[PDB]
Design a protein around this ligand. Structure first.
Ligand SMILES: *Cc1c(COP(=O)(O)O)cnc(C)c1O
Ligand SMILES: *Cc1c(COP(=O)(O)O)cnc(C)c1O
Lengths: 392, 392
């Protein structure tokens, strides 16, 4: 007898292997899997202001460190709704905050509630929903691989098919892995569907401040839905926009249309966090609270974020410029319409396989970490893409 | 309003009371938190951990393999061959427990009955429910009025369990009562497991705390594993190393068929992705140094021995004091109990009256015994003698 005889084969981790290849590859190379950042997830090192806050930092309820929760709600919702319509609790980073929200949705609605997920998405979305036992997982078309844009007609078709009450996982800004976000107009069309079909937004905000370098503008989609009266969930991470991965800083929040339901939501969320931590991680919350609340730290963080987003846009611009100059076949407009640190380069699996023999390392999906590119590496990437497009 | 029928829940039974204890005037005995960091009883790092942190200054998805190996070694020793064990990192005890719960939910069924001791560490229910184990059941464990393990009711409830039921076992230092099965009792418990094909899911948060001997505290884990039975184990280092801030834990699965280990491992790795996007390396490295380095290991073991001796001495002082006063009732449970927490044996009304003498215990008679001192134990002796003789 063996309890586990049916455990079921799973495909192996694509990224981990390929990541080691790029790392333990010679030296004359362009690593766009990990590179300058710390993992293939793209966690950066603590930002300058975060380090200042760590230094300057020299009895919690289960929901966690309330000053941090309040600042986290502020940066996300920005007065789009009244405070009494908002409930927040600490999560262990983005992943923990997603799982809190997913377990909350599973407990208060139903584990059989359909969840729509973008095609493609951040891969561990599936792992989070499965751990919550959200078993009815569906795709909405998102990236159009042929036209190198958001398949917005497909997206709207799939969401217009969503059963009422379906959960939709939404990337707040800097869609991962494509780097391509809806326009404001597209968000308006999306919102109309949510409203007509009474779908449940579940916003994933891991990059507020990365997309445009503007916290407010990056929050457009969250605030559009909240302000127009949508009830919804939000998972916030600070692992990327502050570099606080090790301290596991995040918030899961719920928007209620009825403020009298808020204490009930809060208690339900508090028993859920108990499945995640026995004591709220106070230290990372105190650090983030200080970056958020202190005017001088807050100003320096907003500025470093603005610096990063213009830099990455610059590199994208150089990439596109190099591809136009070489006459590389295809549309390359998507390269300068993308934001955040990941971009879908627009290549086929086969073209990506050949790039990795140039020691230009991207994922086989065409995902490139575009932060960390230098004028030298972007020109290697120009020549590499131009070669594989023409010969593969 | 989606959140209209959210079930009302009871208030946190510790948080408010712990505040009353911390805010009360200085001549007092705080047996809720005291000198420990929080209400769960997480200590500051032991000295060997501090020394490990210092020496450290001189992946894949499952985590830091040498940590996992030493963690399994200390738990299982000679009771099971290495090829029958699969282990992954979890975020402390809670995370490790969640991984195991989600694994069982995934590979067996979410409807699989889960038996949980009455009383238990409260967050067990929240871990199991977040994994969406929906059939949670009590087994009788402690009879508060009799001040002993209700061993006839315990065995009765497990004999009533359906075959394949999951049972959450406290490996040692049962929380919150402090009362563990004897070795003979553990074997009578194992008999029911063996006869009824029950699935042990051990929770080991106090290995080395209970008795100061890592090997002796693993008795029950090793009694069951040396049978060849399949089981799960969640290990925390938050309490016996004081490493809560580093979220160090291990979930292991025992498989009777080594060939299934690769599949088990892949399943676990999918599951940890609901919990963290990159494993908590630093605490694994710290723990690994404590576990494997001859000097640090030996010093860690000495600190554990001293800690357990110290708390036994405080229990013995309390018992001796109540005996000298002739306080009514049986007080043997005081010196039979182990670990940081004790059920002192008081009624709710006796506990309420102790609070007016500023001796703060939970109304469930639970006291953190480990922060007691010669000074404070003498106040507890007199408070207990008082409320026993004068209430109800
Ligand atoms: C990074 C990321 C997460 C998870 O955040 P972590 O903090 O690393 O746990 C979730 N969703 C998306 C879209 C991300 O990019
Ligand atoms: C303390 C405790 C835990 C949780 O471990 P953490 O490291 O704090 O998450 C789990 N189970 C039991 C029985 C405990 O006493």
């Amino acid at each position: 007898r063996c309890l586990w005889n049916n455990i079921a084969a799973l495909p192996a981790d694509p990224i981990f292997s390929a990541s080691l290849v790029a790392k333990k590859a010679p030296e004359p190379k362009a690593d766009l899997i990990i590179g300058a950042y710390r993992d293939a997830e793209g966690h950066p090192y603590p930002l300058n202001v975060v380090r200042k806050a760590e230094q300057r930092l020299l009895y919690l309820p289960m929901s966690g460190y309330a000053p941090f929760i309040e600042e986290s709600l502020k940066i996300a919702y920005g007065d789009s709704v009244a405070r009494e319509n908002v409930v927040g609790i600490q999560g262990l980073s983005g992943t923990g905050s997603l799982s809190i929200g997913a377990c909350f949705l599973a407990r208060v609605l139903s584990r059989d509630t359909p969840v729509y997920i973008s095609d493609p998405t951040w891969p561990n979305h599936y792992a989070v929903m499965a751990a919550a036992n959200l078993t009815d997982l569906r795709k909405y078309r998102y990236y159009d691989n042929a036209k190198r844009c958001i398949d917005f007609d497909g997206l709207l078709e799939d969401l217009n098919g969503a059963p009422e009450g379906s959960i939709v996982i939404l990337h707040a800004c800097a869609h991962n892995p494509t780097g391509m976000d809806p326009t404001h107009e597209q968000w308006a069309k999306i919102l109309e569907v949510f409203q007509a079909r009474r779908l449940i937004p579940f916003f994933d905000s891991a990059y507020q401040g990365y997309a445009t370098g503007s916290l407010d503008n990056d929050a457009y989609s969250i605030r559009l839905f909240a302000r127009q009266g949508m009830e919804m969930l939000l998972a916030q991470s600070y692992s990327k926009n502050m570099g606080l991965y090790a301290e596991r800083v995040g918030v899961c929040s719920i928007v209620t249309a009825n403020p009298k339901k808020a204490p009930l939501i809060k208690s339900q969320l508090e028993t859920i966090v108990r499945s995640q931590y026995s004591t709220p991680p106070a230290h990372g919350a105190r650090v983030a609270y200080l970056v958020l609340s202190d005017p001088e730290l807050r100003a320096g963080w907003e500025q470093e974020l603005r610096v990063m987003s213009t830099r990455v846009l610059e590199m994208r611009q150089a990439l596109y410029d190099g591809l136009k100059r070489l006459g590389t076949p295809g549309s390359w407009e998507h390269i300068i319409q993308q934001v955040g640190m990941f971009s879908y380069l627009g290549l086929t699996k086969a073209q990506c396989e050949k790039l990795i023999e140039r020691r230009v390392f991207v994922l086989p999906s065409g995902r490139a970490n575009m932060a960390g590119l230098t004028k030298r590496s972007v020109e290697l990437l120009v020549k590499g893409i131009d070669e594989v497009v023409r010969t593969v």
